Design an enzyme around this catalytic site. Structure first.
Site, PDB file in Angstrom:
ATOM      1  N   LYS A 242       6.666  70.866  71.708  1.00  0.00           N
ATOM      2  CA  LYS A 242       7.801  71.699  71.612  1.00  0.00           C
ATOM      3  C   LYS A 242       9.225  71.187  71.147  1.00  0.00           C
ATOM      4  CE  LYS A 242       6.396  73.771  76.069  1.00  0.00           C
ATOM      5  NZ  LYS A 242       6.114  74.992  75.734  1.00  0.00           N
TER       6      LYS A 242
ATOM      7  N   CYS B  45      11.468  79.497  75.802  1.00  0.00           N
ATOM      8  CA  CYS B  45      10.953  78.582  76.448  1.00  0.00           C
ATOM      9  C   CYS B  45      11.596  78.479  77.821  1.00  0.00           C
ATOM     10  CB  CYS B  45      10.827  77.275  75.919  1.00  0.00           C
ATOM     11  SG  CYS B  45       9.758  76.090  76.969  1.00  0.00           S
TER      12      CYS B  45
ATOM     13  N   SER C 222      -1.533  79.488  78.265  1.00  0.00           N
ATOM     14  CA  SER C 222      -0.570  79.040  77.052  1.00  0.00           C
ATOM     15  C   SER C 222      -1.221  78.485  75.931  1.00  0.00           C
ATOM     16  CB  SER C 222       0.712  78.368  77.800  1.00  0.00           C
ATOM     17  OG  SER C 222       1.692  78.331  76.802  1.00  0.00           O
TER      18      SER C 222
ATOM     19  N   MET D 242       4.667  78.733  83.241  1.00  0.00           N
ATOM     20  CA  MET D 242       5.701  78.856  81.930  1.00  0.00           C
ATOM     21  C   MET D 242       6.800  79.495  82.682  1.00  0.00           C
ATOM     22  SD  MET D 242       2.360  79.704  80.782  1.00  0.00           S
ATOM     23  CE  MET D 242       2.026  81.300  80.308  1.00  0.00           C
ATOM     24  N   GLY D 243       7.947  79.080  82.255  1.00  0.00           N
ATOM     25  CA  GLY D 243       9.173  79.519  82.738  1.00  0.00           C
ATOM     26  C   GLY D 243       9.282  81.111  82.407  1.00  0.00           C
TER      27      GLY D 243
HETATM   28 CA   LIG Z   1       3.603  75.934  77.662  1.00  0.00          CA
END
Ligand SMILES: [Ca+2]
Ligand SMILES: [Ca+2]
Ligand SMILES: [Ca+2]
Ligand SMILES: [Ca+2]
Lengths: 387, 387
Positions: free
Chosen positions: B69, B103, B302, B311-312
């Site tokens: 990321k 994200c 994901s 995941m948020g």
């Molecule tokens: Ca992820």
């Protein structure tokens, strides 16, 4: 009260097919400038261990043996050496840092780090050419030489040298592991042994102490071919448990442990690996390794799982064992005297050279040689909560 | 003949259960200060992608979706915002950076980074207390608010707030996802649809666009219990492919893509997830999650694999869906009105709030809320070969 995190000067590097966090001794907090719990606790927190989730999302680790590593470098007091090298294998799941071995992959990064960070006599660094870094490997008490390329007084990191298991090309760094045999090369006194694991099986093995204490077994004795990839083994709990018991019994036979139960807490050494004659296979990158491309196949485990390529120390053990006629490694490569072997591992191939010579009717190995590469990934300061 | 690596000022941070490399826009090489090939190429190289080995040994990546990321932050010129937030999900295997989504885990880290790196007016930062950071999420065009604790004029990173999936406690950072529903919450206009998936079958699904576009299906309709851990799915290449085909067809059904083949290179959005009523299970840490501890179970994928936690952005989708009576998420939590839910994921539990209000037969959600934490892991400069 929750004080701010501390900052510790550090460099995050790739060396060979491994990643590690590198420190100058003098950059560490005072308490961590000697071996002990304070040092171990700092390195554990830097990496993100112990982690019951086994993801190392709260540290610098990558949650694999190849990416859970720390290195401390300092000026040497050893005659004819430039830098002292201490390597810590950081457990992912336990609050433990293992100091019992070397890291052969990070050796190239050790040479580069020492030059870049004022740990080498300036008189030994040419403006251009090769800086020969004489490393005292402080874990195992051995000399390792790194021939690091120099451009305009700085390490030449970039280049066109490719190594299987390394995504991008970089500058070639030749490494020489001097006098790799423990100083015995063969602790059992035999080139080959039979490891009896009562109720499980009988296994032909070569047990060698060179690079790292290593147990080599024949792939066929396990029902393997030697072409296996990580997905073939690392989800197979039965197979993993089997490898671990053979490793434990090998450790006992080598005299590294006194009781079989000790193997559970002694995970880093000895290593266990399996060998086979050349056979074609697709590597983990999808590239075909032809039988003609290799002298043999070797797969090795580290910390209880099949390694994605090959540990640098294990590559030394392979080269050294291949040079002694009659070892399982030598026989997998077709027998006879051998100055070098190219072996097939899950990510492709690796060539290692080892000159064995007879003295007084016994084999002596002067050095084992291989080429790696290294590069800085990140440099600055790592942070951990205040000790 | 090979120039040295360039240095780019960067911070490596954990935010929630994710790790990312953060940059100020102005710190990037000029070529990468606008969207395009040069930017994507740089971020790929920083992370170590594309990597045929799928290990990211030659970059900052951790070879998982949670650890591949990049984040680009700058001072916002937008009215009522402090920091512009651009998130790039870096493909492990492909030369692609996905810019289609947010994200949610790294959002807490965005607030902290902005404060620590002068991207918010100093006048808005209290000497001691909580700094309210107004984030413009530039991928999705949404406002997100991060409430970051401040001590002696600096970000308070350390603390005693514990989150399942985060190894060590840190300071709580409250996050508010404002008006999460896409500008529609249910693109099909239905709370539950029959999703036709050619070659697989047909599935009752809630498809919601809130936080991130998400497809929710009942665990049982896929042959699962909802208590599954990563090892139950991530080595099952047939199950994985099935999930990806459904995800692709859901993307088409939601009008996210025009043609089914576009889903191949749009992997970050939508997400696919499965839901179940509360059931007891051992988490990935070995800790028991009791049925009484949760309102429902949710497992999500994901980038093609079952995610290690949640995941948020998917947590936003879960909270929002739970608040609308009749969604598959709402029904898994027992139906009726819900202002918040705690769900069980592979790593433990997560609570999210999202009060919905009904007026004229329509439900609206002002905000979705959750608490996370963030900390700097390494700061300084990342290096890549000269572009
Ligand atoms: Ca992820
Ligand atoms: Ca691995
Ligand atoms: Ca900027
Ligand atoms: Ca993962």
């Amino acid at each position: 009260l929750f004080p701010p995190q501390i900052k510790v000067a550090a460099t995050y590097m790739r060396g060979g097919t491994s990643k590690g966090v590198f420190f100058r001794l003098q950059d560490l907090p005072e308490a961590a400038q000697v071996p002990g719990p304070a040092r171990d606790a700092l390195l554990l927190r830097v990496i993100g261990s112990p982690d019951p989730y086994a993801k190392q999302i709260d540290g610098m680790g990558g949650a694999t043996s190849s990416t859970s590593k720390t290195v401390i470098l300092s000026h040497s007091s050893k005659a004819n050496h430039d830098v002292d090298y201490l390597f810590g294998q950081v457990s992912i799941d336990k609050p433990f840092v293992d100091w019992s071995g070397n890291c052969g992959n990070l050796t190239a990064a050790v040479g580069a780090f020492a030059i870049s960070n004022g740990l080498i006599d300036a008189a030994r660094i040419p403006r251009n050419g090769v800086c020969t870094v004489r490393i005292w490997q402080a874990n195992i008490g051995k000399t390792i030489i790194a021939h690091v390329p120099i451009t305009d007084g700085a390490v030449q990191e970039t280049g066109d040298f490719e190594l299987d298991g390394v995504t991008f090309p970089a500058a070639e760094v030749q490494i020489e592991f001097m006098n790799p045999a423990a100083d015995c090369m063969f602790p059992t006194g035999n080139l080959v042994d039979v490891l009896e694991v009562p109720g499980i099986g009988r296994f032909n093995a070569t047990m060698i102490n060179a690079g790292i204490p290593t147990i080599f077994i024949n792939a066929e004795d396990l029902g393997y071919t030697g072409t296996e990839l990580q997905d073939d083994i690392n989800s197979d709990n039965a197979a993993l448990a089997k490898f671990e018991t053979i490793r434990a019994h090998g450790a006992l036979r080598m005299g590294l442990i006194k009781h079989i139960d000790e193997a559970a807490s002694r995970q880093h050494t000895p290593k266990i690996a399996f060998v086979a004659p050349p056979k074609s296979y697709a590597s983990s990158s999808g590239k075909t390794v032809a039988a003609e491309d290799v002298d043999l196949l070797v797969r090795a485990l580290s910390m209880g799982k099949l390694h994605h390529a090959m540990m640098g120390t294990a590559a030394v053990a392979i080269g050294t064992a291949a040079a002694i006629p009659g070892t399982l490694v030598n026989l997998a490569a077709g027998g006879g005297e051998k100055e070098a072997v190219r072996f097939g591992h899950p990510s492709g191939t690796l060539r290692v050279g080892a000159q064995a010579v007879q003295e007084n009717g016994e084999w002596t190995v002067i050095k084992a040689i291989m080429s790696r590469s290294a590069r800085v990934l990140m440099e600055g300061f790592v942070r951990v909560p205040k000790p």
